[PDB]
Design a protein around this ligand. Structure first.
Ligand code: CL
Ligand code: CL
Lengths: 164, 172
């Protein structure tokens, strides 16, 4: 019953942690791709959608918003630090009580003020939004000639590699 | 424990069901956008990435890959027409109805490892890990691509069409 919310939280917290680490490893790959730093960080897919660095910042902020209840994103060094700061913070956090997971979280979803139990807030609201912005980081990277496969996104898919 | 396995399956299944329904509602919006049908379905976001209709197909098959072994069924790709809005909607509705009608998994089925292939890598993971660590991120990747392609082709979509929680002012 209710105790499974603790198990759901641990599983999804570990999923945010894993994908934040894959995001940090993606930024390292984009860095060593011999591409222009500023051009890459400000690169978009859709004209009215956020650029690469802002997509990485939003995804990181969504992981923090889910797990808790500043920085330079204009350089690869600063954006990596931003992600590492979130990873280290989330790892420091103690295992939640059932009472914490039933506490209502107050947030805004566009123009709508939302109130959800922290458990549903993490899995129903944050989790899909986190994956949306993570997906945008990967698609922008692929669009700018970065050699990325599904393996860089989930750490489970594997494809034959090259050399040189 | 055992209680945890039943509840995690229900939560993950309900998330797939919710987002497949939002995907169905998205295709209805794209259909009613007075855009060219074939152009919109074959539209890409990145040249080396799958088009709109194939992104919707893969997302739907990821939901089926997560739910079929849990009710003791051998996953087979859903066949159908994805080259028309009517066929693509039918494809998603077929998956929703199928998932909804699946029998509640047995204790034995919940305790079994799921065998699959991720590219060239063979995997064997317990039901909870397979659904949440493997399927769920991949499901949301392809769902995200459907939304981004729709937005790129002038379709009026907001985050509300993606998660059913975000709200913005609506048309007059
Ligand atoms: Cl965006
Ligand atoms: Cl793709």
């Amino acid at each position: 019953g209710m105790l499974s919310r603790i198990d759901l939280y641990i599983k999804h917290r570990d999923i945010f942690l894993k994908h934040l680490e894959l995001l940090h490893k993606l930024i390292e790959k984009v860095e060593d791709s011999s591409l222009n730093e500023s051009e890459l960080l400000n690169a978009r897919l859709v004209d009215d959608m956020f650029p690469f660095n802002v997509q990485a910042k939003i995804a990181t902020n969504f992981a923090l918003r889910a797990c808790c209840p500043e920085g330079d994103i204009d350089s690869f060094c600063g954006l990596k630090t931003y992600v590492v700061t979130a990873i280290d913070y989330i790892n420091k956090l103690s295992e939640p009580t059932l009472e914490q997971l039933n506490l209502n979280v107050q947030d805004t979803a566009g123009f709508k003020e939302i109130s959800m139990p922290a458990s549903e807030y993490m899995s129903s609201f944050v989790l899909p939004n986190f994956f949306f912005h993570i997906s945008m980081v990967y698609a922008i990277a692929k669009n700018n000639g970065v050699s990325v496969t599904k393996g860089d996104f989930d750490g489970i898919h594997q494809y034959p590699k090259g050399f040189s």
